[PDB]
Amino acid sequence: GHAKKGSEQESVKEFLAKAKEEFLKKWESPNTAQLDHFDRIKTLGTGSFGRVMLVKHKTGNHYAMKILDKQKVVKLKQIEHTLNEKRILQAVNFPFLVKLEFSFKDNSNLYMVMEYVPGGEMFSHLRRIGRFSEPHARFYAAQIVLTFEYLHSLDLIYRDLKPENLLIDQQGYIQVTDFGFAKRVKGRTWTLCGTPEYLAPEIILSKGYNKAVDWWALGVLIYEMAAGYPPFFADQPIQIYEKIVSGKVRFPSHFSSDLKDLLRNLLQVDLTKRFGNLKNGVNDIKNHKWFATTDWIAIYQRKVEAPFIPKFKGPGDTSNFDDYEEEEIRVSINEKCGKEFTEF
């Protein structure tokens, strides 16, 4: 054929069962700070509902503070998704997931205070250099594979994988952030959500769907990291969607045949054939030839030398992040949307 690998599979099972017990304690039994405890330094990222800011604890430690304007979080699914994000982040623990330190609310806003990861988004490094070599892309992809193996074992789907949401830490490793689309799903779920270039076809077609959409999105991510652009690429979301549902992927001539084979099996419209979704689950991905050089345990243990280490001048350095327009926070004299956000 193509001994340790099977003991390795028992060890995975053992790790995941222990991980599930820790998660469930925090999930069952989830206001740990206040706004005045922090100085606001710079906006690091923005979105339709607020911004993420670099802040400094008035302890000196730096954090990434996500500020959600309750009056912008107005649609039903936008509200549910915010409660999902807080409850999931306070309950998970894994080396490649950002750590939530504090959460609290006031009359106008919700706040989630996370560890500050100063290396920047993978997005800007990838767009600056064009595309990553296959060994470079593989190193990052391996961390995502392990992260999804962890999340899916807790019945969590992530649902917004893309370089914008992957931060590089001081060792060159990835930290997944932005859990706004993440959800506990034991069977299927039905919300039409995510980022157009990364949606699996079943989302677009309004079919109930499951964790296999994360594995499709991993195919999009690996392709984009190795090519510099994603496989379904068009000016307007409706055009992107048409391309996805045909699923007629063309690959750059420099992609290895091992890479193309993995991607054809991840970008598989037929769910009875999509890797990650079959009887052997994640192991069809982990044991694929494109990953034959990958030491999964050494990646988990952070023993592998990273492709590059971002440059940093000190704590609170923001040089690896782009600039955004700043807008002062205004806390209203009156409480807003207190009912919608009672569990936060």
């Binding site: 979105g47 339709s48 649609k75 039903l76 699914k77 936008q78 998704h81 997005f123 767009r127 917004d160 893309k162 914008e164 706004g180 689309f181 919300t191 039409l192 959500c193 995510g194 980022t195 157009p196 270039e197 652009y229 994603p230 690429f233 068009a234 000016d235 992107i240």
Partner: peptide, 13 residues
């Protein structure tokens, strides 16, 4: 010919 800048996720398409 596609989107090269940061991409907004949609919470309910």
């Amino acid at each position: 010919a596609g989107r090269t800048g940061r991409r907004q996720a949609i919470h309910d398409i």
